[PDB]
Amino acid sequence: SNKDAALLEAARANNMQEVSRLLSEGADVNAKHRLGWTALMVAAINRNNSVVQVLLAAGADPNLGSFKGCTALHYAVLADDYRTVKELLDGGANPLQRNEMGHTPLDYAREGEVMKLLRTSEAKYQEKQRKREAEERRRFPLEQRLKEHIIGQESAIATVGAAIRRKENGWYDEEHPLVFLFLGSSGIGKTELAKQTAKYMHKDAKKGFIRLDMSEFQERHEVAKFIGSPPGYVGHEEGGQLTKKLKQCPNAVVLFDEVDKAHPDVLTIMLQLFDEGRLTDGKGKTIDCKDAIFIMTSNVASDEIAQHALQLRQEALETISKNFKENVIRPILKAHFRRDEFLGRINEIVYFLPFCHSELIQLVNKELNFWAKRAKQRHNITLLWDREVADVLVDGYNVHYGARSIKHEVERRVVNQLAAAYEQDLLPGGCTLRITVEDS
Amino acid sequence: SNKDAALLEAARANNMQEVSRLLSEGADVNAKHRLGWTALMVAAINRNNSVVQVLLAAGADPNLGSFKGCTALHYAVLADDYRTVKELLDGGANPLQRNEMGHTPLDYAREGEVMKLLRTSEAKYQEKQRKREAEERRRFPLEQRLKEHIIGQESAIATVGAAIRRKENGWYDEEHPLVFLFLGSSGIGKTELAKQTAKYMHKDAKKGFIRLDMSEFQERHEVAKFIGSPPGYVGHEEGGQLTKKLKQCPNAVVLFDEVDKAHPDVLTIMLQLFDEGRLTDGKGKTIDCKDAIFIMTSNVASDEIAQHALQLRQEALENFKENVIRPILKAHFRRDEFLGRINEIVYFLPFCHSELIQLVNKELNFWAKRAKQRHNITLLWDREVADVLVDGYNVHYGARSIKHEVERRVVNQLAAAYEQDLLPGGCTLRITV
Amino acid sequence: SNKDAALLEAARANNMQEVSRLLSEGADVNAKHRLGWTALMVAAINRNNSVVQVLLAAGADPNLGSFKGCTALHYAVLADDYRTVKELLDGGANPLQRNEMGHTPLDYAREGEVMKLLRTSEAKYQEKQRKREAEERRRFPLEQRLKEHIIGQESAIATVGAAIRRKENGWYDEEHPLVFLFLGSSGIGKTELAKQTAKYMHKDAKKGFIRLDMSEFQERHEVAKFIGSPPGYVGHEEGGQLTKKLKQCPNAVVLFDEVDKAHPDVLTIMLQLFDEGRLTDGKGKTIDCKDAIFIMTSNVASDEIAQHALQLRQEALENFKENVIRPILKAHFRRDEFLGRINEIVYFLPFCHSELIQLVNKELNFWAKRAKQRHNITLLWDREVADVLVDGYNVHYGARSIKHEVERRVVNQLAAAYEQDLLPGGCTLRITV
Ligand SMILES: Nc1ncnc2c1ncn2[C@@H]1O[C@H](COP(=O)(O)OP(=O)(O)OP(O)(O)=S)[C@@H](O)[C@H]1O
Ligand SMILES: Nc1ncnc2c1ncn2[C@@H]1O[C@H](COP(=O)(O)OP(=O)(O)O)[C@@H](O)[C@H]1O
Ligand SMILES: [Mg+2]
């Protein structure tokens, strides 16, 4: 504890020797004084450029929070010393950091070298971040990330990626959220695509992905879950759940899984959300989510979508459907979703088509790779197969389930055999299996 | 208040006599000083090994939470004293516990004895966890207990054991919960089998088993009873039966009795739950049930199984390609989702004569061993009277029916004799009726 | 604190004047010193027999808890003063109570009169226990006990007595809760039998009785009353109506006064009462009901007995047990859970002419003795007046009909006569109609 006080006193007195001795002895570089200032901070206010430099080289943090709450950069600007401001900025100081009073390094000092340094640091940071992010996106676009997991559905991936890129590059109106409606048969990756998109946007934030299941909303009064009860009713003080989640992460990705299962008057609450990204809870607080992304998944027109997809498979063949027939898909949606204004607010309608033979083979290969890696990681068993296995597994495909049919087929026909053999201790650790078309 | 302050001062001053006197008087061992540290904490920072020893022996907690938020172990490490750290760890201190600033004892530990001791404690905890897992794996197979407590239903026992073992050994996507559909006549061990399974996995916890009878869930408004009402509606505070119980034990075993009677909108929530393993209560709290086990029971095809009896009376009385059960079930549900998601289908067969006499022998043995008027024990039941008790065939009502049968002409006579003081020392049950 | 310290010092020094002054001033007789010894304790260890006497006369407790945890009896016995030990025991001190170290006063006692006195007190306690056991044994036959205050319903009384004996004698599924369903019209002794049973079984005052009207329990009141509004719910009435009383008497006789009016939610939560009991309280407490007695009642089956009268006319007076198995009850209350778990069903028969006239006679006797100027009571033609009263036979809602008959045809006439000053003494009755 004495080391921190000694370092603070040395920094206040501009004692280079004492500051260096304390730092080399393990003294807290960001030591805090009882008055609320640190060694780097009091060095900054006292125009101790050398002390500030040595403290920064020792690991001083200039962004740590009357001048109460003013950081090291704030005090450097207060002294109107440009050398200290430049050194702190080179050390990672934020030129726009704020104190308890809200003052910033860009306000304390008069126009001059300090302002120039702060502005240049801010501009260079912003430009570097912009260029780096753009280059990263170019190098590894969203489409490749989705293709890592999603198989087929090229049109849907292209549409979603185009919309997302248009949003990220700033070429989007901020007055209206972006809304998607995923349509297609069951078990073809709609909610999977939504999950992948949410992960891409908010990879390191669970709060960034808000999931709803509209099976849990199959009656009119279920709207009270979204915004909570009005004043004087049970649960009022709680407030809306969806409103809470949106307030936590305004730019999150909201997924209304199986929206078709909602009562139609539950969708009415979505009008303001989809138009202006505005929603009011039971307490009257209004949530602004203009930059959020809304995804709705349903299979309302599944049969018609499959029939259309046959168009590609109806070709004389001597892949991409124009799908102007959406004019006759609209009546189905209107019949289910009874309000035209609801559909009008949807930016894009994404159609997922049934898998082709090659896509089915790819799915089977994906499943067998997953199982092989699981076996290697768990029991250290190598697992291998040929075309005959993929084709035999595909032959058991069911249209009504898609990827789920493939999963069940692989599990039943192959995984059961691996489990039975393992339980019989016929699989020594490190051994290799070929599935030599093990059938019938 | 004076006792706590005196204990804190004595611990800070390494005064064994004062600390011992305060502990004997009844001073709080975990007393907290106004500066944020306890007596154990200050004894630790001051390298008061003996004070730490006496405090821990009296019940001091070293895991209680600049050095703000530092625990007793944190303070001992900060003092770089091996003795205090060792004593606190022996008292249950966690070497990886984080203070309010996110610094663990390992972080504060300088390389040397303290670091090695903290790593040794961490290794001890990890090895204890690994040994617990190894014992859990190596313990008796579930099928053993099933056979111990279940009579007959060998096919069901084998299927359930195989499924559970496969799940345990991997070989099963953990992203989706196991879903079982139990078919067959009622009162033949379905619920007993589920309880035993719940016993295998949660022998030490009753909460591991949950029941719902879908005779409660036959109309649209009963969906709100399943997962809670919306906020501002009747019963919102209750939050629904299913979620209220699952939130206590996500990896429990859930038994849905007579899913046939479930209203379609309830069938929709169950299928959603099975597919995802994810459910929201009415209060907005979400529950993850990926590793849970869901068991559905019904008698939709009980008659077909009983009459066909493709194993009972035909192959084994303890694949048959019972291909009619699939269309029978399809006729009763949304076959696309309902039957697609089911992981396994388990058949229960009616009891046989051998199973019935085994059950009667087990009931008579339960009555005989529990004879608290001990000296009348060895009231031995010969053989043929147990066969006559089986001859009161009540399989329609299930095993408990046979239990009642036995109790009637096996317990009433014992109670009458005892009340009459007629039969000290016990007797053979011999022949009656 | 000053009064407590002064009283403790006076007791230590055997200062009778100071002790009396402090006691008269309101000083805590059981004042406890910071070292763990009270005024009575220090008076006892110092052989201050007079101080102990005056403290006990003032309400000192000699059972108040290394001598840590030692009672005043322990200290008096340690001092080896016969008078002090005798005085403390006279106040209720237990000669076998253990201190925090597990040492009883007998262990501290030295050979002499102290041994004899402590053993005499222990023998007194043992004799009290044996006397209670003998009284409970003499309570049998419980059928006579009930008949002392009940008329008719011999079959139900005998059934209840036999069940009680079986459970006591180990001839019952004691692991499972004990539950009766009582069936018949209203006002035919159901509540009267439940109350008499509670009065007899429980020592006195029916402290262990718990009766509730399930008609007030609905979806808006189920948890708020049955479980009792738990914390965080609308209302804080934890326990509410049932489990607030079960906290004291786990083996309560608990009456539910109409399951026909009980809500499905409360009938489901009542499923906890069976299996193991352990019904959840609003405070979270659960009571093992394996020993409890539950008495559900209903009038929905009231016709099953009254419409026949064979269960009454053909029960060895001059029909069969479960003539029809749960005729209406299974369809109404979901026998699978609610009634399947009920151990026994008790029928209640319509009152006979002899029973009705006996009720009339007892009520008339009560009114006669209830008279303040009993000299005017002659009860001439009391039997004939009862014959007239029974004309309004109880066939509507129970014995309350006969009570109203008596009130109308007797009490009003007597009140009118008294108002007319026609009741000087030695007054006969009057035969109306
Ligand atoms: N196109 C796909 N490519 C690779 N995996 C897929 C694909 N589609 C689905 N899957 C996988 O198969 C499962 C199906 O999940 P979903 O994506 O959610 O199905 P779904 O289309 O969204 O439709 P529902 O809700 O049954 S209507 C997931 O396990 C996916 O991981
Ligand atoms: N070995 C056994 N086999 C079958 N049932 C048993 C066995 N032991 C006890 N039982 C009884 O079987 C019942 C188990 O639940 P059960 O009634 O058979 O399922 P369900 O009612 O849904 O058809 C219990 O009442 C239990 O007492
Ligand atoms: Mg989906």
The 3-class SS string of A309-338 reads HHHHHCCCCCCCCCCHHHHHCHHHHHHHCC
Per residue, the 3-state secondary structure of C286-346, as one string, reads EEECCCCEEEEEECCCHHHHHCCCHHHHCCCCCCCCCCCCCCCHHHHHCCCCCCCCCCEEE
The helix or strand, by DSSP H or E, that contains position B89, with its residue range, turns out to be helix B82-90
CA C8 to CA C39: how far, in whole Å? 4
Q: How far is the CA of A330 from the centre of ligand 1 (A)?
A: 24
Closest CB to B372 among C35, C68, C170: C170
- Would you state the structure tokens that stand for residue B144, as one six-digit string? 């053993």
Angle at C164 between CA C163 and CA C168, to 5 degrees: 115
Interchain contact, A419 vs B169, CB within 8 Å = yes
Residue A124 lies in a domain: no
Contacts 24+ apart (CB under 8 A), B397-403: B397/B187, B398/B185, B398/B186, B398/B187, B398/B188, B399/B187, B399/B188, B399/B189, B399/B351, B399/B359, B400/B187, B401/B187, B402/B356, B402/B359, B402/B360, B402/B363, B403/B363
B-interface mutation test, from C171, C266, C272, C336, most B Cβ less than 10 A away = C171
Which ligand has an atom closest to residue C336 CA? Answer: 2
Strand extents, DSSP E, C27-183: 178-183
In angstroms, the separation between the Cα of residue B150 and the nearest Cα of chain C is 19
Partner residues linked to C38 by β-bridges: C32
Interchain contact, C264 vs B234, CB within 8 Å = no
Q: How far is the CA of A258 from the centre of ligand 3 (A)?
A: 7
Query: Left, alpha or beta for C326 (phi > 0: left; psi -120 to 50: alpha)?
Result: left
What residue ranges line ligand 2, CB within 6 angstroms?
B 149-151, 186-192, 257, 297, 398-400
Residue B44 lies in a domain: no
- The answer to whether residues B40 and B74 touch, using CB atoms and an 8 Å cutoff, is no
Resolution (A): 2.9
SS3 call for C421: coil
- The answer to whether residues A383 and A371 touch, using CB atoms and an 8 Å cutoff, is yes
CA B274 to CA B263: how far, in whole Å? 17
Q: Do B277 and B205 reside in the same domain of the chain?
A: yes
- Would you state the structure tokens that stand for residue C128, as one six-digit string? 């009290």
The helix or strand, by DSSP H or E, that contains position C84, with its residue range, turns out to be helix C82-90
Q: Do B176 and B293 reside in the same domain of the chain?
A: yes
Q: Do B359 and B317 reside in the same domain of the chain?
A: no
Q: Do C312 and C218 reside in the same domain of the chain?
A: yes
- The answer to whether residues B39 and B19 touch, using CB atoms and an 8 Å cutoff, is yes
Q: Which of C327, C350, C373 is the last residue of a domain?
A: C350
Annotated binding-site residue? B149:
yes
Q: Do A281 and A212 reside in the same domain of the chain?
A: yes
Interchain contact, A374 vs B170, CB within 8 Å = yes
Identify the CA nearest to A363 among candidates A384, A338, A393, A385: A393
- The answer to whether residues A224 and A181 touch, using CB atoms and an 8 Å cutoff, is no
Per residue, the 3-state secondary structure of C261-281, as one string, reads CCCHHHHHHHHHHCCCEEEEC
Q: How far is the CA of A151 from the centre of ligand 1 (A)?
A: 10
Q: Do C268 and C190 reside in the same domain of the chain?
A: yes
Q: Do C287 and C370 reside in the same domain of the chain?
A: no
Ligand 2 pocket mutation pick from B185, B190, B192, B397 by most atoms within 8 angstroms of CB: B192
Residue B219 forms contact with C (CB below 8 Å): no
CB atoms within 10 A of CB B90: 13
- The answer to whether residues B253 and B202 touch, using CB atoms and an 8 Å cutoff, is yes
Residue B227 forms contact with A (CB below 8 Å): yes
CA B96 to CA C430: how far, in whole Å? 95
Residue A421 forms contact with B (CB below 8 Å): no
Helix/strand/coil percent split, chain A, to 5: 55, 10, 35
- Which residues in chain B are closer than 8 Å to A228, comparing Cβ atoms? 231-232
In angstroms, the separation between the Cα of residue A316 and the nearest Cα of chain B is 33
- Phi first, then psi: what are they for B424, rounded to 5°? -65, 160
Cα-atom radius of gyration of chain B, to the nearest Å? 31
Chains that touch A (3 or more CB pairs under 8 A): B
- Phi first, then psi: what are they for B28, rounded to 5°? -60, 120
SS3 call for B180: strand
Q: Going by C-beta distance under 8 Å and a sequence separation of 6 or more, which residues neighbour residue A86?
A: A113, A117
CA C244 to CA C241: how far, in whole Å? 6
Which ligand has an atom closest to residue A410 CA? Answer: 1
Q: Which atom of ligand 1 lies closest to the CA of A151?
A: 3
Question: What's chain A's length in residues?
Answer: 440
CA A246 to CA C95: how far, in whole Å? 69
Identify the CA nearest to C146 among candidates C156, C137, C138, C136: C156
From atom 2 of ligand 2, which residue's Cα is the shortest distance away? B150
Q: Which of C350, C385, C402 is the last residue of a domain?
A: C350
| Residue A162 to residues A106, A147, A155, Cα–Cα distance (Å) | 39, 14, 10
- Which residues in chain A are closer than 8 Å to B336, comparing Cβ atoms? 186, 400-401
- Phi first, then psi: what are they for C309, rounded to 5°? 65, 5
CA A153 to CA A359: how far, in whole Å? 9
Residue B222 forms contact with C (CB below 8 Å): no
Residue C340 lies in a domain: yes
CA B123 to CA C419: how far, in whole Å? 96
Residue B28 lies in a domain: no
- Would you state the structure tokens that stand for residue B414, as one six-digit string? 């014992």
- Would you state the structure tokens that stand for residue A45, as one six-digit string? 């206010």
Q: Do C238 and C328 reside in the same domain of the chain?
A: yes
Q: Going by C-beta distance under 8 Å and a sequence separation of 6 or more, which residues neighbour residue B222?
A: B216, B263, B266
Q: For residue B203, give the amino acid letter.
A: K
Method: cryo-EM
Interchain contact, B418 vs C169, CB within 8 Å = yes
CA A129 to CA A134: how far, in whole Å? 8
For chain B positions 264-323, those within 8 Å of chain A (CB to CB) are 265, 268-269, 272, 276, 278-280, 282-284, 286
Q: Do A364 and A287 reside in the same domain of the chain?
A: no
Identify the CA nearest to C327 among candidates C305, C296, C295: C305
In angstroms, the separation between the Cα of residue C379 and the nearest Cα of chain B is 45
Identify the CA nearest to B171 among candidates A377, A436, A363, A387: A377
Q: Going by C-beta distance under 8 Å and a sequence separation of 6 or more, which residues neighbour residue A138?
A: none
Residue B190 forms contact with C (CB below 8 Å): no
Question: Based on the structure, what is the number of domains in chain B?
Answer: 2
CA C184 to CA B321: how far, in whole Å? 52
Q: Do A201 and A339 reside in the same domain of the chain?
A: yes
Q: Between B and C, how many residue pairs show a Cβ–Cβ distance under 8 A?
A: 39
In angstroms, the separation between the Cα of residue A433 and the nearest Cα of chain B is 15
Q: Which of B328, B350, B372 is the last residue of a domain?
A: B350
- Which residues in chain A are closer than 8 Å to B111, comparing Cβ atoms? none
Closest CB to B414 among C35, C171, C219: C171
Interchain contact, B231 vs A244, CB within 8 Å = no
Q: Is the dihedral of CA A327, A331, A333, A338 positive or negative?
A: positive
CB atoms within 10 A of CB B14: 16
Partner residues linked to C280 by β-bridges: C286
CA B91 to CA B56: how far, in whole Å? 6
CA B341 to CA A408: how far, in whole Å? 9
Q: How far is the CA of B192 from the centre of ligand 2 (A)?
A: 5
Residue A263 forms contact with B (CB below 8 Å): no
Residue A291 lies in a domain: yes
Residue C249 lies in a domain: yes
Residue B192 forms contact with C (CB below 8 Å): no
Residue C138 forms contact with B (CB below 8 Å): no
Containing structural domain, residue C391: 351-433
Q: Around C198, how many Cα atoms within 13 Å sit in the side-chain half-sphere?
A: 24
Identify the CA nearest to C79 among candidates C105, C97, C59, C116: C105
Closest CB to C170 among B25, B225, B373: B373
CA B97 to CA B126: how far, in whole Å? 14
Residue A106 lies in a domain: no
Helices B190-202/B154-168 angle, 10° precision: 30
Residue A201 lies in a domain: yes
| Residue C433 to residues C385, C391, C410, Cα–Cα distance (Å) | 10, 10, 12
- Phi first, then psi: what are they for A256, rounded to 5°? -100, 85
CA C273 to CA B191: how far, in whole Å? 18
List the shell of residues around ion ligand 3, using CB closer than 5 Å. Answer: A 191
- The answer to whether residues C337 and C296 touch, using CB atoms and an 8 Å cutoff, is no
Closest CB to B216 among C169, C234, C268: C268
CA C403 to CA C389: how far, in whole Å? 9
Q: Do B306 and B404 reside in the same domain of the chain?
A: no
- Which residues in chain A are closer than 8 Å to B68, comparing Cβ atoms? none
Q: Around A360, how many Cα atoms within 13 Å sit in the side-chain half-sphere?
A: 22
CA B234 to CA B102: how far, in whole Å? 44
What residue ranges line ligand 1, CB within 6 angstroms?
A 150-153, 186-192, 258, 297, 299, 363, 403-404
Q: Do A221 and A324 reside in the same domain of the chain?
A: yes
- The answer to whether residues B157 and B259 touch, using CB atoms and an 8 Å cutoff, is no
Which ligand has an atom closest to residue B348 CA? Answer: 2
CA B43 to CA B23: how far, in whole Å? 14
Query: Tokens 């006197």 correspond to what residue?
Result: B21
Q: Is the dihedral of CA A191, A354, A386, B173 positive or negative?
A: positive
Query: Using the 8-state DSSP alphabet, how is residue A221 labeled?
Result: G
CA B72 to CA A5: how far, in whole Å? 25
